[PDB]
Amino acid sequence: NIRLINMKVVYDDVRVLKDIIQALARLVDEAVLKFKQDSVELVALDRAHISLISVNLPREMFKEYDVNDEFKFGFNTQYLMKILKVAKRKEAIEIASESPDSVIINIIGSTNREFNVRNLEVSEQEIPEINLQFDISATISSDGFKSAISEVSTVTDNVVVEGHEDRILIKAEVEVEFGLQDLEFSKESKNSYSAEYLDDVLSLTKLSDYVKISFGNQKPLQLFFNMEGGGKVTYLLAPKV
Amino acid sequence: FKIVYPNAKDFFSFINSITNVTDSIILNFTEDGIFSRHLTEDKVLMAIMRIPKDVLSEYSIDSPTSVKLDVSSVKKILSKASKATIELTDSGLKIIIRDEKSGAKSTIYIKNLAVNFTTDESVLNVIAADVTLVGEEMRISTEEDKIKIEAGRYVAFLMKDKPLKELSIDTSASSSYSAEMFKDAVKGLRGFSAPTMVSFGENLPMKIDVEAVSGGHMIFWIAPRL
Amino acid sequence: MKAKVIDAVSFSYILRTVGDFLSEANFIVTKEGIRVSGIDPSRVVFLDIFLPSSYFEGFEVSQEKEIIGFKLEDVNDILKRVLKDDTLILSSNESKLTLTFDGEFTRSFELPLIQVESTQPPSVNLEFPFKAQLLTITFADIIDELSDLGEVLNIHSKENKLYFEVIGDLSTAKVELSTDNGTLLEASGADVSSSYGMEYVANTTKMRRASDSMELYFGSQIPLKLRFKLPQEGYGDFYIAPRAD
């Protein structure tokens, strides 16, 4: 049964989305949220193809989730940041659609702030595989990670990440040694990664208590944020070398 | 070498104060503890830190000595690192900060005044900003049971409980001072929420003194205008 | 003259708002109170502030009409120095305006008077086809939220509901205010539509610190009048010229 409003989603935690979209806006000008039966999905390769963000938000995280037709919401990322920024503390957001060329976004309050937006078509990109075999996985504090990146970034653009059995270290060559909630070890690793690109995604650290950090010699850096509803944000960053 | 300060923030406040003119400083380690000094080129403003050894959770040396270091990087790292302790230890010094919330261990490698009143850095910051709006020279004085500050035109009166915690005046006095040197000294009280003691006299230095919550003094001497 | 305003902070927000439009102004002082009016250098905005005798927690005049010319940056420079809980005394003579703050401690700022020629006021007694009353917080929040969306605010009325819109080629933002949803306390008049410069209106949201409720008046190709009601029958009136259709 198809209703005049054929797609309608209600999300009551706009900070999450704001943290996701703020990181996305640093990476690309336009992106696509694909609302599917079971989840909302977003994959975006940055403009230089040096990094990749991948987002999955299960339908359970939503107050209302109505999607039969997969729906592709293409948007300019700066503009969506401005829309999400309209919301006050714990106001919900509704994304709805009556036809494929437009999206209605309501910021829900005593009076709604209603955005009628043109749906964009966004060209498809070749997308790098995100699940490689890494040499080490360390789970640490998300705040700890953010703090370590910020500390090391005031001094370098070369964020060095050093993995050992018992230690992950985040270095300027300053050293920050993890605190280490979990670790999976194959081989001792050392690689470096751009502070500019890491700075891009510091808002993602707000999404979960802990971050899974995976890397290796001559391998990219993966950051994985498992959130409280089953939501997953993954970030992949090529070595700087 | 092994020095252990109770709070990283207080030591962060100290390092910042002794580095207003330059990012280079000389720390002095003696039997009595750490001493540090900086004096402006015109020698109108003197910054002094004194940390007695009994304030430190641990203190150990092998001989009284000085270290000259560049403090610029450790400034910006600790500016992003913020409750924790701080350690100091061939090419120079090594600093250890340990956050007990995150668990992160972060290591940085580096190569006779008549008048007397007590207040806080808040009030002194209001005054310095008020003075700077109107002129480059501040006149401070005694008017009966209150303290008069004049610049430009601007006049302020401080008295006990409005806002002064303490006021003692055993002889009438007035002195003039560079507003910008006062502004810089008052700036150096950032991070120190403890009561702040101000002292002066007839055409004599102003002393501004504050103890850190965990111990140790940040001191400022300002040459008068003659 | 001499006048004590107890809520110095709110008074400073009034003069901050006046500073967004005017370089110089006159406090026009009479027995009934203090008036500040002027037109912005671009002539799109006329403002008219009235602060009655009773607005002041102690008020006295040394003549029939005293004219006090001042540069807004200089006065707002001194007002930036206000503390939370400060009282303010405004004292005057032939040469100087004195601003005295009272609270944590006493401190005073002296300002030499400047000569400022009076504004020839525009047509103000207009017949606005639409009038609304609302909470100033409601207005200020909505305008703050829309102010970064575009340079032009469209306003239209439909069967007594009031709409604020920002229109773009690929997006429209719309807010509907009505007595029905509780966002307007009163609204009445014809269906009319006009556009106005966003920045001029965005400057006025500061008035939330001095005003609990306000009135909005406009029409099709008619200036937008915002009247912020102040304590003791005071008001801050701002009239913003309409853009071309």
From Swiss-Prot, chain A:
A Pfam family annotated for this UniProt entry: PCNA_C
Top-rank taxon, per record: Archaea
Keyword DNA-binding (UniProt): yes
Molecular-function GO term, any one: DNA polymerase processivity factor activity
The keyword Cell cycle belongs to this UniProt entry's keyword annotation: no
Entry keyword set: DNA replication, DNA-binding
TM segment ranges: none
GO biological process terms on file: leading strand elongation; regulation of DNA replication
PANTHER family assigned: PROLIFERATING CELL NUCLEAR ANTIGEN (PTHR11352:SF0)
Family: Belongs to the PCNA family.
Quaternary structure and interacting proteins, as annotated: Does not individually interact with either of the other PCNA subunits, but is recruited to a PCNA1-PCNA2 heterodimer; does not form homotrimers. Heterotrimer which circularizes head-to-tail (head is at N-terminus, tail is at C-terminus) to form a toroid; DNA passes through its center. Replication factor C (RFC) is required to load the toroid on the DNA. This subunit interacts with DNA ligase, RfcL, XPF, and weakly with DNA polymerase I.
Known function: One of the sliding clamp subunits that acts as a moving platform for DNA processing. Responsible for tethering the catalytic subunit of DNA polymerase to DNA during high-speed replication. DNA polymerase I, DNA ligase and the flap endonuclease may be constitutively associated with the PCNA heterotrimer forming a scanning complex able to couple DNA synthesis and Okazaki fragment maturation. Heterotrimer stimulates the Holliday junction resolvase Hjc.
Protein name: DNA polymerase sliding clamp 3
Organism: Saccharolobus solfataricus (strain ATCC 35092 / DSM 1617 / JCM 11322 / P2)
From Swiss-Prot, chain B:
Membrane-crossing residue ranges in chain numbering: none
Swiss-Prot/TrEMBL GO biological process terms: leading strand elongation; regulation of DNA replication
Pfam family, one: PCNA_N
InterPro entries membership: DNA_clamp_sf, Pr_cel_nuc_antig, Pr_cel_nuc_antig_N
Alphabetized SUPFAM superfamilies for the sequence: DNA clamp (SSF55979)
Keyword field: DNA replication, DNA-binding
Assigned protein family: Belongs to the PCNA family.
Function: One of the sliding clamp subunits that acts as a moving platform for DNA processing. Responsible for tethering the catalytic subunit of DNA polymerase to DNA during high-speed replication. Heterotrimer stimulates the Holliday junction resolvase Hjc. DNA polymerase I, DNA ligase and the flap endonuclease may be constitutively associated with the PCNA heterotrimer forming a scanning complex able to couple DNA synthesis and Okazaki fragment maturation.
Listed NCBIfam families: PRK01115.1-1
Protein name: DNA polymerase sliding clamp 1
Encoding gene (name): pcn1
Curated annotation (Swiss-Prot), chain C:
DNA-binding is among the record's keywords: yes
Gene3D superfamilies: 3.70.10.10
Keywords: DNA replication, DNA-binding
GO biological process, one term: leading strand elongation
InterPro entries hit by this protein: DNA_clamp_sf, Pr_cel_nuc_antig, Pr_cel_nuc_antig_C, Pr_cel_nuc_antig_CS, Pr_cel_nuc_antig_N
A GO term for molecular function: DNA polymerase processivity factor activity
Pfam families: PCNA_C (PF02747), PCNA_N (PF00705)
Oligomer status and interactors: Forms homodimers with PCNA1, which then recruit PCNA3; does not form homotrimers. The heterodimers interact with RfcS homotetramers. Heterotrimer which circularizes head-to-tail (head is at N-terminus, tail is at C-terminus) to form a toroid; DNA passes through its center. Replication factor C (RFC) is required to load the toroid on the DNA. This subunit interacts with DNA polymerase I (dpo1). The heterotrimer also interacts with flap endonuclease 1, DNA ligase and XPF via the other subunits.
Function: One of the sliding clamp subunits that acts as a moving platform for DNA processing. Responsible for tethering the catalytic subunit of DNA polymerase to DNA during high-speed replication. Heterotrimer stimulates the Holliday junction resolvase Hjc. DNA polymerase I, DNA ligase and the flap endonuclease may be constitutively associated with the PCNA heterotrimer forming a scanning complex able to couple DNA synthesis and Okazaki fragment maturation.
Similarity comment: Belongs to the PCNA family.
Protein name (Swiss-Prot/TrEMBL): DNA polymerase sliding clamp 2
Provenance organism: Saccharolobus solfataricus (strain ATCC 35092 / DSM 1617 / JCM 11322 / P2)
